[PDB]
């Protein structure tokens, strides 16, 4: 549940987001800050140091796909379950990712947005984004419910 003001503030800031770099930074920081997430990405190569993680080309490329799904979600806020149906099935039945990790990635993305926009990422702007990431996490965890 987003108010019309909150919806317009989220959409306005998202149009300024560099998709080619924000995604790679959010995925990279999840692997560095929460090291247990690395076991799901063994086939991505060298993840031994923070510098090796941030410089990994497979991490950067995958990050773009993650942000693409978030963009799709922002275009269909009224129907999040439908927009993430197959992705929920993939993460649950094939990868077996604990749903708590969806909340962690959402929070890391919020940190990355604050880092990229500075004082433009105001407390009301953060409040609306927290509602979005929680909605995305809940829609991804549906096939577990």
């Amino acid at each position: 549940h987003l108010t019309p003001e909150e919806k317009s503030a989220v959409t306005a800031l998202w149009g300024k987001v560099n998709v080619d770099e924000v995604g790679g930074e959010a995925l990279g920081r999840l692997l560095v800050v929460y090291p247990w997430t690395q076991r799901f990405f063994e086939s991505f190569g060298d993840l031994s140091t923070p510098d090796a993680v941030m410089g990994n080309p497979k991490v950067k490329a995958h990050g773009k796909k993650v942000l693409g799904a978030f963009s799709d979600g922002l275009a269909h806020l009224d129907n999040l379950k439908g927009t993430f149906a197959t992705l929920s099935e993939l993460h649950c039945d094939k990868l077996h990712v604990d749903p708590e990790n969806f909340r962690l990635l959402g929070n890391v993305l919020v940190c990355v947005l604050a880092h990229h926009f500075g004082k433009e990422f105001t407390p009301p702007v953060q409040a609306a984004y927290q509602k979005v990431v929680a909605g995305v996490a809940n829609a991804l965890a549906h096939k577990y419910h």
């Binding site: 990279g28 920081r29 800050v33 919020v110 604050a114 407390p123 927290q130």
Partner: protein, 139 residues
Amino acid sequence: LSPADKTNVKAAWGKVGAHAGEYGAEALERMFLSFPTTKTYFPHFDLSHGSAQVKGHGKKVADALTNAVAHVDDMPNALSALSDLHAHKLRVDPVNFKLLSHCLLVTLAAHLPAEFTPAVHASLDKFLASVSTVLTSKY
């Protein structure tokens, strides 16, 4: 904390300096707006934007964190009195320490772009989780 984490925390907090109080007040404001459940612990407070009470309380939080950085090897002893207050007297739900820690990280990311590297982000998250563990130790 590991030696690498101690060095990262001391270096990042040194750059914060005289702005600690300001960052503490902003982190509290971010928490109240993003997580409205946290507001129930402050009914006697003026919670509007730019509140003198929030500014004053943000300074006290920042002073406790600055003291924890200086006593990083003896955190349970330095924060002992604060554990009794938050757990026994105020009965603060442990989930709220995670919510405030996240809001402090968002505040630092917005004010220190050159300092908030992935390595420093990881060390500050570990430091704040250690502070939270000490403050909920009486449970």
